């Protein structure tokens, strides 16, 4: 066999990668996806089903599959677990009562033997109010350090501002791609 075509394609960029968008409802997941794709704070109705989009950055097509946090859609996250390489968790630091529910949902989704190669991606959404915690208090409460064989990274992203999205994208690219 010959791999000349593959080498030629990789000389200018061939890897695309994937990504997932899961978390509690009203956690800034749709707004974060809109900011990553377009770059504006778009107001949308609650995600009854799901939203599928793609982001082109660093020569990698970062496809984002937004998943709602509805009760009827919480157990539907297993549908996107098939043929999935990445996973992004959106935390809701502005909902103290919903923080436990989000942590339980993340633990349930992380306790499946089918989703093992998807590295952890914790995004601190709603990072605009004083009640939002830091990048370590939320991780300590969620116990991200206790996830064996899981590469998790906590990043604070402001839905209204958009700061920290570039850092999260760079971290995801570094975790997915292991080349120069």
């Amino acid at each position: 066999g010959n791999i000349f075509a593959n080498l030629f394609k990789g000389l200018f960029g061939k890897k695309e990668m994937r990504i997932l968008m899961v978390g509690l409802d009203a956690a800034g997941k749709t707004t974060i996806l809109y900011k990553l794709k377009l770059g504006e704070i778009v107001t949308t109705i609650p995600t009854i089903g799901f939203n599928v989009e793609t982001v082109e950055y660093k020569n990698i097509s970062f496809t984002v599959w937004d998943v709602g946090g509805q009760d009827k859609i919480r157990p539907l996250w297993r549908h996107y677990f098939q043929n999935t390489q990445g996973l992004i968790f959106v935390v809701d630091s502005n909902d103290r009562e919903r923080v436990n529910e989000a942590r339980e949902e993340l633990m349930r989704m992380l306790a499946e033997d089918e989703l093992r190669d998807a590295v952890l991606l914790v995004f601190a959404n709603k990072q605009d109010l004083p009640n939002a915690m830091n990048a370590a208090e939320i991780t300590d409460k969620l116990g991200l350090h206790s996830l064996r064989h899981r590469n998790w990274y906590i990043q604070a992203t402001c839905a209204t501002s958009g700061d920290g999205l570039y850092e999260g994208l760079d971290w995801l690219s570094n975790q997915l791609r292991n080349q120069k």
Binding site: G49, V52, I73, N83
Partner: protein
Amino acid sequence: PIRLRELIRTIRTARTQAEEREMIQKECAAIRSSFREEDNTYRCRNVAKLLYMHMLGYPAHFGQLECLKLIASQKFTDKRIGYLGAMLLLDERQDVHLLMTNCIKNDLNHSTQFVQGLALCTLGCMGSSEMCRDLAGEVEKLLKTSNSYLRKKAALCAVHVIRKVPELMEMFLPATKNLLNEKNHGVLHTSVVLLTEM
């Protein structure tokens, strides 16, 4: 990606029931292999083959997520294939149409008159007890428009919602008032049917 005509000819070439079942399984294996790779180019052919196999009497449970993925796609052929799959292999008792509510809502505000019409037809054909609850607001918005080609679809969707949800008829009374003067025969027939149902 085998074409629909080729699959139909292959099915017709089978004489014995066992041979036909073996051919159907051989085609379904390739279809499942293509679907597991997240194929998006020849997805329409795979969807058509799966629908043909299901209509001939073969299981099509594995081809449920593919139809949902194609419903939220952008291609017209892919959207039509997804709508046909949802109408055929999707029902209220399927339990996988809950995620289709978001796709229907997204396609309900589409500027194209074909995607929105297809979504409305699919919603009317496979209306559920919960889909109409979260889709009643959007149905009434399209019923007050002046689109002759969409007025009949809106009337049919409202009739289907009323049949599925008898308590939602109160939201259609102020929308069907002063709608008996439509020049088009289809719009008048839809209005008469809606009035009779109410």
